[PDB]
Amino acid sequence: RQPSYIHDKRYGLFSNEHNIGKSRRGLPHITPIYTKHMSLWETDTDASTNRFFRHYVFGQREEHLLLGRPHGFEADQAGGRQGDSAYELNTDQRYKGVPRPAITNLHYEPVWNQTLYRNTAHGNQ
Amino acid sequence: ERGLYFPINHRIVDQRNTLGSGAEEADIQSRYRRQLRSSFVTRETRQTEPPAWSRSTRPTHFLSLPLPARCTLRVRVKEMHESMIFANQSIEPLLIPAAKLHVTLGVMTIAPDVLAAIQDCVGQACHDTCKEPLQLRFRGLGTFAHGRVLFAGCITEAHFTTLDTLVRRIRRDVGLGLGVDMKGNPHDSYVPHVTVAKIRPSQIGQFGRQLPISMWADHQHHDFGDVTFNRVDLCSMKGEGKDGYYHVVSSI
Amino acid sequence: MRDPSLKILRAGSGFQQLKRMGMPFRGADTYSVKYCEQGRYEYQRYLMINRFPSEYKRHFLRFLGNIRGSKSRDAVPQEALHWLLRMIVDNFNPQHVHYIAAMRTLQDSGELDMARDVWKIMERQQTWPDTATICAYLDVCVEAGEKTWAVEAWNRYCTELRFLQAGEVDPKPITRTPFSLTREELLYLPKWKKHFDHDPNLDVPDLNRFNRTREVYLRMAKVMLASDDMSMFEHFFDKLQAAMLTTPTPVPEPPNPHLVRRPRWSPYEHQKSLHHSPWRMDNNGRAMALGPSRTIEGEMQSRFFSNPQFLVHAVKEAVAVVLQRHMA
Amino acid sequence: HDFLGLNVVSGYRPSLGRFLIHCLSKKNNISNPVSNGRVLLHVSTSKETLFDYGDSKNQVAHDDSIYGLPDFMYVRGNDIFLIIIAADNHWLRKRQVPHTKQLEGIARRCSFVLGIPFDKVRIRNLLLPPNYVDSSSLRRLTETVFDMSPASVKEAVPWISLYEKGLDAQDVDYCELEKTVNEEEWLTL
Amino acid sequence: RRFTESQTYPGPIRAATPGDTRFYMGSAETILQENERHYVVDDPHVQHLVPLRVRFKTFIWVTSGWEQRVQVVQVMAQRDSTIAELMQQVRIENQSPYLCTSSFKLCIDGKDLDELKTLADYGIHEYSRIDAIEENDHLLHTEAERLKDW
Amino acid sequence: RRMPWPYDLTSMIFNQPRQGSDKIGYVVGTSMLKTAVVAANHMVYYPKFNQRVSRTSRFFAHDEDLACVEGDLVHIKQSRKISKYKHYYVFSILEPNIEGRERLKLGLKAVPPPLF
Amino acid sequence: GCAKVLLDHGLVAGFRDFRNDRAFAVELKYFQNEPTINIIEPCSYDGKTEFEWSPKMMRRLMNAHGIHNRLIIYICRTADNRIIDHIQAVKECIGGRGLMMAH
Amino acid sequence: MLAKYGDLTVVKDDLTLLEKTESYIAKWRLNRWEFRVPPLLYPAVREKVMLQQEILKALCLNRAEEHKHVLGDIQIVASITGISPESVREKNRAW
Amino acid sequence: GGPGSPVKGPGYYAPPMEGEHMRGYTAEWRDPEPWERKYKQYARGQHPSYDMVYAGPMPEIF
Amino acid sequence: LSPIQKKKQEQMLYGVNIPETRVMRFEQQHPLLSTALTQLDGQPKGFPFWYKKYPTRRHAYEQRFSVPTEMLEGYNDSIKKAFSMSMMTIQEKQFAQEAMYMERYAEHDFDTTSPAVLAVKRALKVRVLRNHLLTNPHNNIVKTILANTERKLNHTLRRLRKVDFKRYWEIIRDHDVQDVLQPPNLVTYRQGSYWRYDWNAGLAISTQLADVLDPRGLNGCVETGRSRSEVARDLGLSYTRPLQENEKKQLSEQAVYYERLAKFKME
RNA sequence: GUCAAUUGUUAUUAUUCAUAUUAAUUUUUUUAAAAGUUUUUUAAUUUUAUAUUAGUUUAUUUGUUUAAAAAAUUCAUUAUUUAGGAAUAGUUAAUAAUAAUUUAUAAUUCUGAUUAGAUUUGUUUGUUAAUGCUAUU
């Protein structure tokens, strides 16, 4: 079975007990637990990582059927896709949308991310 | 059973009222939904609010597309005017002179060198763009300044897209390029409109704050007809109807 | 007869597996040795969660409620730091209100090093703190008495801060349009570019609009004054002086209603009288009967001052430390 | 700033026009800039028209692959030079190279309008790298196309020797374009 | 009052005195459709219609015996209005017949309000405490107060 | 057995704060006031067949300025309960039926009437 | 890509990409006047279903009762759109959808 | 453009101010390049302006790192030869 | 720690296509002891291997 | 047929000539030819100067067999009559009307797959097919292609209207082939399948909104969550369908109510 | 990165289908079980809130202090059975703390609604090598 720590990370640490404290809860149909492997999440993961998105016939098909992407029942691109659409082909999407988040800099300049406390200064010396 | 046991009127909470005081000291009452009325039901639209320091100063010049006569706009709104002086003769001192009906685009507080540079600028801002004769289809009346102004609401259907760039094109230049004050200083899109009515500041004591809803509740969404605009005009508002129109000092 | 390998290889997404995915023999020998290799928390991937537009604020308030509420009586001074972590652990990027709420609560509780920890966290989170936040950390640096801290934070974040010159316009109007997606950007840009959690560095462009630059040079001169490094203090306070007199009054910033207790409508007729009990005269919410437990100078925040008054106040704020420097 | 290709948008073509004027201003007159629109000529009848016709880098893709399009046309007299900023497209690039029919097509048409003798029309080409400019280009430009007294080159262009942009390997083939086989107009463009 | 006593200076100093500023439509946003704000950080200030609290007194027939509770009406007040309009303005928002049984003169702390004055002369804001007294304040002490069932 | 398939169009384009938070669909009905009926696709995946089919449903959404004309592509989201059946609001319209506005500008209905 | 894989396993003599859009040519190879490709079958009899293969779902096939058995060849289209045989597919331990089998 | 930067100091070898100005840019961490975009600009340029900022952002790191080791590259000589890090910049092959 | 492991991330940083700098692309790589001869051969793959695959039958001698 | 549809058949009986749009294009583009063509008038002209006039061989429809009217001048009038639009078989009279109309809407003169052209090519065929079918009522062979032609009609129209409704109105108004466009039924319209057809075609997002309804209001803020309208309200833009009277009268009342409250509760 | 593995003696052939095992009713004394809840000064008042019914498939949803103990809500999306199939009806929406006779014509329904029949809505079983079939409050 899936573990339960999946619940916390998606919603919140210890979000469980607060929800349990409901007066009319669990009777008769409880709100079940969101235990879904982190790579299988509906929202966060893209197509290249979530295998289910790689479905085509009723999945990626409608997308390219909407976006205008030249799409076939099977082809060279990821999911039933042959070539870019007129929009993708003509417009620059490097810096469109959310600005490049500052925390990216943490990668190339890694001195910032440093354990402030000695792991042994927790009480286990 | 017939009405909801706790209808929406019992499904309202307010933050100014301290939840825990108005709920836990005594019963609060207020016609809340009247306060939450959307700006669509009222047609109160947010034109650019000028900086308070500019609010003491009064508008001197205006750049505006003067309405072409014979167009469907007037013969529909002049049909409204006669319909309104019919409803209330009191609207006649309030009404905008049907001679002076025109699209109001920009308010500037200017003297001649200021006129000449913009004359070059709008003479270029149009020529930088080289737009074709604009056609703006008006529809739906609305209110500025908490009702003190009633204007021809300009829908964004026909040609507004190439237009509202013109606003931002001069506004970038006339405001920040050279030193010309405007009410809408920061590059801002000034809602272009034809003021069908306007309460004078002196008249506010005469007729009240709010131009009556019952006066324009009939044609709140009347369709005022597309008009083809070809010439932009910069004008001073010092006079009234110099040629049936205010004093002209530029055009294009 | 259909292949048995097919009869297995066909139903790979068999609802039995679906349960084990959670979509709706056993000794240590079998489990791989490569298990013990994964370093601490490397197994976790990135997580980009979008929360409800409202619940972005509610969740922030509860965090804002604990931090500025931790130092009540029971919760440890440290607790203010522990709530900042529980937010960040769950990917709610910690906004500037939750930073100031920590440094304020921590300083009030005599915790100075921990007050810096909150500052390093926002140095770790790579969140550029606005001027209002920059002065905050310098304030603990005053209690910390370290020139080595403020000088460090000085170069990194508040380098280009310049006094409002007489010719410059005034506190800048809001320029950051809220994040809005044209349908083109929405349909074609990938998921990772279409997720928006309020990054604290987004409004920092406009979080500097009210031009609190003057409070900076004072807090820095204060630190230079605290660490006996008066050689730096003069150059700062002199540069503060000459500009405090010529530059216009920096427009004071209205109080942020998220941080401060904004008052709220209330029927004050159902209030216990001052002599509600026969035994003692009480101080009711409406009227004060015992009087002020503290002598109050009655003056508003230093930012509400004029341009000169701040300067002479800067002397009062400076010499108060010269007291504490000696008194410490 | 443009010649070094740092202008990632609208790369160096208009600035190239300025340079050619400056390369030609110091050549004869500082009061030269007679820009009657697209034509920027010299009047001494030793004609040095610097007529720029259109933007090859940004028009040959969208319409009418008129290879003859000289992003700049600088006649020197008998020699009729063409300066074309080569398209980044390896494909359209061979639809910027003027072809034999276009060469003698222009030459027989410039002899009339400019009075240049029919025999002495010597039309030539020069295509710069697509996005940046190289150091050899500036030299062979100021040495052959815009024939310049070498001392005056230091005067008109002081930073010529200081220029260091060397052709990146990827875009060395910017020049080596081949004529399509006469029988393959279907497959090749 | 610390928040309010603070923002008292942004009144003049933020908007009135600065001969230079701009106010930018767009990125100057409004309230949501999830019944709440949306977590942005600024506003100089403005309130054209100041919501005025007007508290009343009316009896309700409790099961044991009559008792009077505090029915407060929260009315929107034009900051440039005269009180005579206010008394006229408020009467329509009763929502309960038992409130505006007859004429009533609005009152502050027992000191009656002068109708020919505006809210500026009296300096009434939201936190101003405006009771509401009916004409029969002399009554309801006399034995004809109200008739209960025994 | 027919289990709900979250991975779909609306899931792949939009990060859904929770299940079915936002939806996208065509404006089938604008007869009612401030309420644009939309038909959107919620997926069901059959583990038996191993093939998944689409079951299209009808949702109501609230458009304030009556901006949604018949035949538009709207990107709605969930919200507080407005009525017994409205809990959606038209967050944005992607594809406006230009004809629908113009065919109304002529004075007709935004779509020719159905046959049966 | 499939014929590219079958070729390297030898079930076919040799493919050729004529770059024709419609169809390319693959040379069958016979032994004992018996075709090398005894049973070749497409994994998904229907296009609507596209079965994906865990790196363990393939690995179980290589073991026929305790002997590492590479007799059958399964083709997998990796997420990176690399047409890969099940043998290499478990080598770098990556999954993909299942196109067909051959043995 | 030009009119703004107008104060003139002709006492500058091509290297000194640059090598000096480089040092300040050398110590620059990445976040220094965060808010350099002019705010109120069109999506037509709010795209194109960000790109050009990334090019300069690229080149500075180039002139920073590729010169960073150069000082060490000079120092390798000083640590071996024992001469000033300055004079190495002029020592020849014959040396 | 297989392929589903969170991406380790790139090493360098080259923002544009218009990334033009010679003397670059050399800054990515900047590469006593008695090693045993055989192993330094085997470590470089030049050493003749002997897999289990070159094993015949284990014959019954006794 | 119906009043609008038969209006075209009148233009079929006596035929249709070239529109002046083609003959004027040829002039303003090739001056030496038009000067040469009007110079050789009436004379038997031995060189086809008017070759650029009629690019596609089917672009010649004024006379029979696509014989261009210019070739006929040098002969006796007896010949010019035998090839007149009067003496055409009906099977040509369609190709005369078709090649005429399809020329008018041809964005690309040589193209025969432009959704405007492909529309009219079938659209006119449907009429004369209906013209036939109703006259002699029972002909199964004709009825089947009527299903095939309407399918290629709707597949063209529902695709066309997204390209440009302006041209599109001419295809529907002038021929009144709207009847096949009217949604098939309520179910296929209720579940959206009538609208989803534009999706299943791929022309969902193909408008280039810069023409109408400037997108500065069609996109609610993702940061804020504001609905579509609020971002127009905050920008002062209006995006409203021209209301029906059904929604007009109900909107008048909503605007007067809390004012009407000032009417009733003064009593 | 350690466990998928199929056992009927048939009876020309076609067609899952009599006599098999597993799990169940048959099948039997080893887990229940009776009354009087209990306070309190006031004939009173504090404290003493969901097994067992009747008929439901667009269905059932939630707490201000009660307790704890020293500004969190009334809404929702989904999934819904009958072999042979047509209408439903105190209506829908907008006003509003209207509307026993306001304003619209609206609302459900063949994408199978309403009435009628059966069934208490299922992290629970059994069978199996297993998508499945087959139970459950």
Side-chain angles (χ1 to χ4, degrees), chain B residues 15, chain C residues 57 61 64 68 97 253-264 303, chain E residues 3-4 6-7 37 39-45 47:
Chain B
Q15 51 86 15
Chain C
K57 191 183 176 186
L61 295 182
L64 187 57
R68 219 172 82 260
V97 290
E253 176 158 35
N256 190 1
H258 307 286
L259 182 58
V260 291
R261 294 283 181 183
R262 163 185 174 174
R264 299 179 67 177
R303 67 193 209 265
Chain E
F3 161 81
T4 42
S6 163
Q7 54 75 33
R37 192 63 182 267
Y39 197 78
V40 306
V41 294
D42 274 332
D43 205 328
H45 51 272
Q47 302 90 16

Side-chain angles (χ1 to χ4, degrees), chain J residues 14 40 80 98 102 131 156 171 193 213 218 223 242 258 261:
Chain J
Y14 79 106
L40 306 174
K80 317 186 191 192
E98 281 187 324
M102 290 153 57
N131 178 276
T156 316
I171 313 312
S193 278
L213 307 161
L218 286 83
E223 169 266 351
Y258 278 102
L261 198 56

Side-chain angles (χ1 to χ4, degrees), chain C residues 56-223:
Chain C
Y56 270 136
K57 191 183 176 186
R58 291 286 295 267
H59 281 307
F60 283 177
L61 295 182
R62 176 164 61 106
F63 300 160
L64 187 57
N66 310 142
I67 307 160
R68 219 172 82 260
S70 69
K71 178 43 199 158
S72 298
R73 184 178 168 88
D74 261 327
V76 55
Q78 167 194 4
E79 178 86 34
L81 181 48
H82 156 67
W83 287 100
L84 200 70
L85 298 193
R86 187 191 306 216
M87 158 167 49
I88 301 168
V89 170
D90 211 280
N91 291 311
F92 301 79
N93 40 8
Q95 292 287 292
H96 290 256
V97 290
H98 307 323
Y99 286 134
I100 305 165
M103 322 204 76
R104 196 33 178 174
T105 295
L106 287 200
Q107 179 182 2
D108 290 26
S109 278
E111 310 264 351
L112 292 188
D113 37 350
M114 292 186 182
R116 188 182 189 276
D117 292 23
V118 175
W119 165 256
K120 272 211 60 49
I121 289 175
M122 71 176 108
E123 282 199 3
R124 194 168 68 185
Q125 296 298 105
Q126 198 49 250
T127 289
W128 197 326
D130 52 298
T131 292
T133 47
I134 293 186
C135 274
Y137 170 64
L138 302 189
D139 185 284
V140 161
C141 277
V142 171
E143 208 171 296
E146 302 277 359
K147 58 169 180 294
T148 182
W149 294 5
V151 164
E152 167 271 347
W154 170 264
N155 297 113
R156 293 194 196 260
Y157 299 102
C158 55
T159 293
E160 75 272 17
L161 272 178
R162 185 66 182 90
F163 287 96
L164 170 64
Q165 306 315 290
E168 268 84 327
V169 52
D170 261 335
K172 187 82 165 174
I174 303 181
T175 79
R176 182 188 85 97
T177 172
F179 196 74
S180 158
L181 292 176
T182 311
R183 54 153 190 198
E184 277 80 33
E185 312 162 300
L186 164 70
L187 290 183
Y188 296 94
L189 276 153
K191 177 80 61 65
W192 79 275
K193 282 297 279 282
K194 295 185 290 184
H195 168 279
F196 169 87
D197 66 330
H198 298 285
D199 181 281
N201 294 315
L202 300 184
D203 193 274
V204 170
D206 288 0
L207 287 168
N208 305 339
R209 76 202 209 109
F210 267 117
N211 189 253
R212 282 156 318 280
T213 303
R214 53 172 199 183
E215 293 176 352
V216 194
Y217 275 74
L218 160 64
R219 290 291 165 78
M220 281 311 283
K222 277 180 66 178
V223 166

Side-chain angles (χ1 to χ4, degrees), chain D residues 114-129:
Chain D
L114 300 198
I116 322 297
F118 194 98
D119 49 357
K120 308 178 180 20
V121 293
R122 316 189 38 82
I123 180 167
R124 308 192 70 177
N125 301 313
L126 183 148
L127 59 96
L128 295 187

Side-chain angles (χ1 to χ4, degrees), chain E residues 34, chain F residues 59-61 77-89:
Chain E
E34 190 69 347
Chain F
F59 297 100
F60 297 153
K77 284 203 142 45
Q78 271 198 358
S79 65
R80 57 151 298 258
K81 289 296 300 294
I82 307 191
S83 69
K84 203 180 200 184
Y85 300 109
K86 277 171 40 198
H87 38 276
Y88 281 96
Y89 70 99

